[PDB]
Ligand binder design. Structure first.
Ligand code: API
Ligand code: ZN
Ligand code: ZN
Ligand code: ZN
Ligand code: ZN
Length: 415
């Protein structure tokens, strides 16, 4: 996991309001939480103070849509064997929580049903955790903001001013953890209370569609930020339609290794003969995105590209040495010569032509005449469209080889 800071543009403004640590994704099958932290990171600005964000605590489990591959990570904050696979991660998390710079902690979850204080039915009862705002105790002496109960009551009131359906009404849950809630005594927020941080958990119901879960998580975040007097902005209107559009953001991309950025959405469901660097374990292959919850994971003979719990495409890998010597290629684009950098996307209105290179072979994927296809003037009508990266059939791979090594890729997009 990674921690990402959301700070004011002026460094000196960091100490002028409180500091929140915002965490989600300790359970890998709770996408409301880690899509909310993602959207917070992408679309909000913190104007004074600081919000530190760990958008997904348990990324290996998120990648396999799993509650916890190594067990429940949210029961590992008390006793823990040093040989537990997550022991180092727990120590990193405790370190972040217990830093003197942190004042408050907000931990996001998705939970089944809808909590009610007395039993109604199977979906609505006190054993359920959905749509409630949780504290371990009413007060934490020594904290900058000791009145957890007041903060919670006000945060709940804020959320409840924006209910989508009345059944979704938020309720307070005080677990009184120090008084023998054996389970909660091993969880993250109790650890935070014991470091004299004001700590809260927000749980959105799993009965809700993802965009509604994320809506309630953002409402909780905004409610707590208002209580803390951490000033913020966001670049969208907070409603489920907007949230849906921002999760399904067609501007999202992924850059795998030194390859060109590819769009996250509307990829073909399988990409064949996809070059990946050899002798590299999948978790160590670099992958960048403008989102914060994107990754690669092995599944049988494929490598999945994941956006949270969403499967964006199935890579059928071609493991090969990535020779980094080739920096750029001379291409004619729409009659005009230019030096195109390896790893870029070039837009094409009409045509292109790759100038031949002594020791480099070009394969235009979807075009045919160990193919060498430099020296051909290529138009959209020359492509077999099923080789496109995208469902829209506009984006094609050009792969370069200095045999038997991969020298890089350029994408052409027909516009
Ligand atoms: N349903 C959650 C409750 C966690 C509440 C609080 N102790 C926290 O850590 O977030 C769980 O069983 O993990
Ligand atoms: Zn935005
Ligand atoms: Zn959870
Ligand atoms: Zn409001
Ligand atoms: Zn040149």
């Amino acid at each position: 996991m990674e921690m990402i800071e959301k700070a004011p543009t002026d460094l000196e403004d960091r100490d002028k309001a409180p500091h929140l640590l915002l965490l989600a994704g300790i359970h890998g099958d709770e996408p409301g939480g880690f899509n909310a932290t993602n959207l917070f990171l992408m679309h909000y600005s913190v104007l004074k103070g600081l919000v530190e964000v760990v958008p997904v605590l348990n990324k290996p489990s998120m990648l396999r849509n799993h509650r916890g591959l190594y067990g429940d990570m949210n029961r590992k904050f008390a006793a823990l064997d040093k040989k537990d696979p997550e022991y180092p991660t727990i120590q990193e998390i405790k370190s972040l929580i217990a830093k003197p710079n942190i004042d408050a902690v907000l931990h996001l979850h998705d939970g089944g049903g809808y909590y009610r204080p007395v039993y109604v039915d199977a979906m609505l009862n006190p054993k359920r955790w959905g749509n409630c705002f949780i504290i371990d105790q009413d007060e934490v002496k020594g904290a900058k903001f000791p009145n957890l109960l007041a903060f919670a009551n006000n945060t709940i009131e804020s959320i409840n001013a924006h209910l989508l359906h009345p059944i979704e009404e938020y309720h307070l849950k005080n677990t009184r953890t120090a008084q023998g809630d054996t389970e909660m005594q091993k969880a993250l927020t109790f650890y935070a209370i014991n470091q004299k941080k004001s700590a809260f958990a927000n749980e959105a119901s799993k009965e809700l569609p993802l965009a509604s879960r994320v809506f309630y998580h953002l409402q909780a975040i905004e409610g707590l930020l208002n209580q803390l007097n951490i000033p913020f902005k966001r670049d969208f209107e907070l409603n489920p339609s907007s949230v849906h559009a921002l999760i399904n953001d067609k501007s999202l991309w992924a850059k795998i290794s030194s390859l060109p950025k590819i769009p996250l959405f509307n990829l073909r469901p399988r990409l064949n003969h996809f070059p990946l660097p050899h002798n590299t374990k999948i978790p160590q292959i670099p992958i960048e995105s403008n989102a914060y919850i994107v990754g690669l994971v092995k599944n049988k003979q494929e490598v999945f590209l994941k956006y949270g719990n969403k499967l964006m495409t199935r890579l059928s890998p071609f493991y090969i040495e990535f020779d980094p010597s080739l920096e750029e290629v001379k291409m004619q684009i729409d009659n005009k010569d230019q030096m195109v950098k390896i790893g870029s996307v070039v837009e094409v209105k009409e045509s292109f032509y790759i100038h031949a290179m002594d020791n480099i072979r070009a394969n235009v994927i979807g075009f045919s005449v160990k193919p060498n296809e430099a020296g051909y003037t290529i138009r959209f009508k020359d492509f077999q469209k099923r080789f496109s990266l995208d469902k829209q059939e506009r984006i094609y791979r050009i792969e370069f080889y200095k045999n038997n090594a991969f020298s890089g890729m350029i994408l052409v997009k027909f516009v």
